[PDB]
């Protein structure tokens, strides 16, 4: 164990680089935690959970996910029966009880190295074959689950709907959209304003039809790697070695974070504004309309008008044919939410139609998003940013995007950390510059 | 040689250059050189870029009555929103300037330049045969760069709220930023301060203690510096002398015997201090704000005892009304 | 725009005189030997 063969204690985990028997013990145990944490929050939230009020009101970061797969939700976002929510969390706990148990088994009584007990499971980091063999299986398994999503989508129950012709809740997809036209070409869109990169996903059935590919791409991946072996150009780069593998994992995992940061903060389709709370762009958006209707309701016509700032009191005509809201909201004219789009006409909002076409839910719901416009404090002092001690909340939609970002940020550093130590290790001088012969010592002196 | 490419590739990588251009330099050099050129010009001559087409044009250009202090490149308008807004996409050239193009042009080439720089420091270090962690240390500013330039406007959905780049523009930014998000009371910033000071602090001591202790190769008349011969394999500064110094000044336990232990801690404190800020901003960009304790005190009579934070809560509440 | 009329001389002398004073010392050093 000790530092004598190794390095110091504060870093002491990487003593495991060459011990695979201990290494499985780590992950399986670690995975045990993640699982155990998952179910814990579920039950933890479920005990403090109030089914009547909305979810984002509860400060609830998990049950929305379970719900989003359409269990116990009901139409209207009713959150009908909590028992499916209960089953999910407890099962993960019981699953963890097995994991860590195994994680311990490999940690101690399990063989300290796997090169012997099972040659199949045995692997050397520097080997570019038996390792790539492993990369197949996971890439197969990880591809299985993607399909197993669609099994929920197309077959068992049905996934939650952002946009229904009314109520925006529950639908079982029939025909998923698949073709490289709108899929491969989908991500080809600009990342920037007005076109999300992957964050657009207008239709639900995109993701299902999309995951089909990622389902059937990954299954090819394993079959590809299982039956193949790295080519020359691969071998010349990439620094095959224990660290680098971890280093690559980070970079991918990092960029995933910023993407995950982006969805939760913007995309309404996947995370329904209903029980995840309204998106930041929608918040000021909907608020802008509630002011609109309340004044338009009573003895006032806001259609053709000027404001004290000069742009008009509510509606403006964008450079595009569509007409939008004014105020600060004009910076978001791109937003299309479940309630707003029908109110919109062929070009922009149809004012005559706006007055008539309001629903009982829309106006109510659109006003319900007025109170919650993502904002708050760490002690949860809420209301509008400087509004004083009223309506105290922080919308969960704001937590995730904050959280995962910070983590995703570190993993950029982490990636940029190990990638240094990985290559330098392979380069051999990671142990510090050599006092005998300094590489710089003999060089052409500029 | 045996080929043009194989020879050319050998020249880019080559270390004999007075300025090392690695493969990252292939992006870095043209983009930055393209940023600066389109910067200094746009800084000098900018048409009165408009933030809101509703009509207040803003002249941050240098030609119009602006000291360096007041002059800045106005960011893009709200009318343009967050849309990618290159030259050709804009209708007319003057249209592309009047809506704040040159801002959106600089920061892209700058950032995408700044990133490749972060690597260019790396791929030199790899080719001089030296432990390559500088690129880790350099992430701290680059974290801040992306945070204030690229990220924070995404939280606002428009580059208008991005940092106007200029010495007055920056001041305007913070103050307004202070209005909405109450950044001072935020903890992450409150560490960033410690990260900067303790950087400057340690920068003084570790600068001082070693200058304090100098093995003397110099005469009193001659400069004290010149005695150091570039490439001395003697130790120019006594640790034993300076150790007990700080070791007597405070208790002898904390003196950090090991330079290799010290200098790392010297470089950990400022960096980690800065990361939290670039996290503190991104925490703000999403409207997760610094906790503002308000009406923390109240009497039995319902009156407001009005603790200090309220003063700040008012000052901010003061600013936000001012902005609009 | 309107300005301090003499403020320009300020810069020039504040630029040149400290600058020059560094050159003169330097060119000397170059002549040493």
């Amino acid at each position: 164990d000790q530092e004598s063969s190794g390095f110091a204690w504060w870093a002491g985990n990487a003593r495991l680089i060459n011990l695979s028997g201990k290494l499985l013990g780590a992950h399986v145990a670690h995975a045990g935690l993640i699982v155990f944490w998952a179910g814990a929050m579920t039950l933890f939230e479920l005990a403090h959970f109030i089914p009547e009020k909305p979810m984002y009101e509860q400060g609830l970061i998990l049950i929305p996910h379970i719900a989003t797969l359409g269990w116990g939700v009901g139409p209207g976002g009713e959150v009908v029966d909590t028992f499916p929510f209960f089953v999910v969390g407890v099962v993960h706990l019981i699953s963890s009880a097995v994991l860590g148990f195994g994680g311990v088994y490999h940690a101690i009584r399990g063989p300290e190295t796997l090169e012997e007990y099972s040659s199949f499971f045995g692997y050397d980091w520097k080997d570019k074959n038996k390792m790539t063999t492993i990369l197949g299986f996971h890439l197969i398994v990880l591809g299985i689950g993607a399909l197993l999503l669609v099994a929920k989508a197309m077959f068992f129950g049905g996934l939650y709907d952002t946009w229904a012709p009314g109520g925006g809740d529950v639908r079982v997809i029939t025909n998923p959209t698949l073709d490289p036209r709108v899929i491969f070409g989908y991500l080809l869109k600009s990342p920037f304003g007005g076109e999300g990169w992957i964050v657009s996903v207008n239709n639900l059935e995109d993701v299902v039809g999309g995951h089909i590919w990622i389902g059937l791409i990954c299954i090819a991946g394993g079959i590809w790697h299982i039956l193949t072996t790295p080519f020359g150009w691969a071998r010349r780069a990439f620094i095959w070695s224990g660290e680098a593998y971890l280093s690559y994992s980070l970079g991918a995992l990092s960029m995933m974070g910023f993407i995950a940061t982006c969805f939760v903060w913007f995309n309404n389709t996947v995370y329904p504004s209903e029980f995840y709370g309204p998106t930041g762009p929608e918040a000021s958006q909907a608020q802008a309309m509630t002011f609109l209707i309340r004044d338009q309701k009573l003895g006032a016509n806001v259609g053709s008008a000027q404001g004290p700032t000069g742009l008009g009191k509510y509606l403006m005509r964008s450079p595009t044919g569509e007409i939008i809201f004014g105020g600060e909201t004009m910076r978001f004219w791109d937003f299309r939410g479940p309630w707003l789009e029908p109110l919109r006409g062929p070009n922009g909002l149809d004012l005559n139609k706006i007055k008539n076409d309001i629903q009982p839910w829309q106006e109510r719901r659109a006003a319900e998003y007025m109170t919650h416009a993502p904002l708050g404090s760490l002690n949860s002092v809420g209301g509008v940013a400087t509004e004083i001690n009223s309506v105290n909340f922080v919308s969960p939609r704001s937590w995730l995007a904050t959280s995962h970002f910070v983590l995703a940020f570190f993993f950029l550093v982490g990636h940029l950390w190990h990638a240094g130590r990985a290559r330098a290790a392979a380069a051999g001088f990671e142990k510090g510059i050599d006092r005998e012969s300094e590489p710089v010592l003999s060089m052409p002196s500029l | 040689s045996a080929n043009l490419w194989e020879r050319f590739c050998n020249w880019v990588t080559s270390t004999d250059n007075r300025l090392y251009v690695g493969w990252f330099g292939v992006i870095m050099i043209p983009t930055l050189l393209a940023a600066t050129i389109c910067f200094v010009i746009a800084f000098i001559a900018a048409p009165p870029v408009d933030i809101d087409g509703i009509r207040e044009p803003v002249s941050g250009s240098l030609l119009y009555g602006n000291n360096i202090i007041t002059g800045a490149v106005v960011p893009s308008s709200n009318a343009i929103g967050l849309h990618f807004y290159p030259i050709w996409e804009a209708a007319s050239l003057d249209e592309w300037l009047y809506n704040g193009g040159p801002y959106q042009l600089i920061i892209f080439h700058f950032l995408l330049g700044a990133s490749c720089y972060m690597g260019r420091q790396w791929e030199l270090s790899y080719r001089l045969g030296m432990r390559p962690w500088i690129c880790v240390a350099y992430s701290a500013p680059l974290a801040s760069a992306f945070a204030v330039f690229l990220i924070y406007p995404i939280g606002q959905g428009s580059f208008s709220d991005g940092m106007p780049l200029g010495i007055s523009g920056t001041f305007n930014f913070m103050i307004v930023f202070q209005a909405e998000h109450n950044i001072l009371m935020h903890p992450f910033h409150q560490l960033g301060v410690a990260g900067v000071f303790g950087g400057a602090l340690f920068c003084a001591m570790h600068g001082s203690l070693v200058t304090s202790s100098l093995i003397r190769e110099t005469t009193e008349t001659e400069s004290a510096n010149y005695g150091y011969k570039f490439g001395q394999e003697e130790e120019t500064y006594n640790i034993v002398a300076a150790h007990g110094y700080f070791g007597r000044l405070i208790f002898q336990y904390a003196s950090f015997n090991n330079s290799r232990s010290l200098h790392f801690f010297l470089a950990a404190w400022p960096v980690v201090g800065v990361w939290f800020t670039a996290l503190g901003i991104s925490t703000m960009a999403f409207n997760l704000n610094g906790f503002n304790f308000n009406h923390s005190v109240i009497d039995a009579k319902g009156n407001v005892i009005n603790t200090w934070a309220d003063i700040i809560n008012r000052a901010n509440l003061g600013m936000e009304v001012m902005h609009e | 725009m309107e300005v301090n009329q003499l403020g320009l001389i300020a810069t020039a002398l504040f630029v040149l005189v400290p600058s020059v004073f560094l050159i003169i010392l330097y060119v000397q050093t170059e002549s040493q030997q």
């Binding site: - | 007075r18 000098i44 240098l62 009555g65 570039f230 | 725009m1 300005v3 320009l8 810069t11």
Partner: peptide, 30 residues
Amino acid sequence: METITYVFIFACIIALFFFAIFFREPPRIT
């Protein structure tokens, strides 16, 4: 007048940079 001094002052900075990077006397070893 006003502006043209700044560009001048700012110019000599650059004319120092390019000048100070390449033309420095190499500090040889030993």
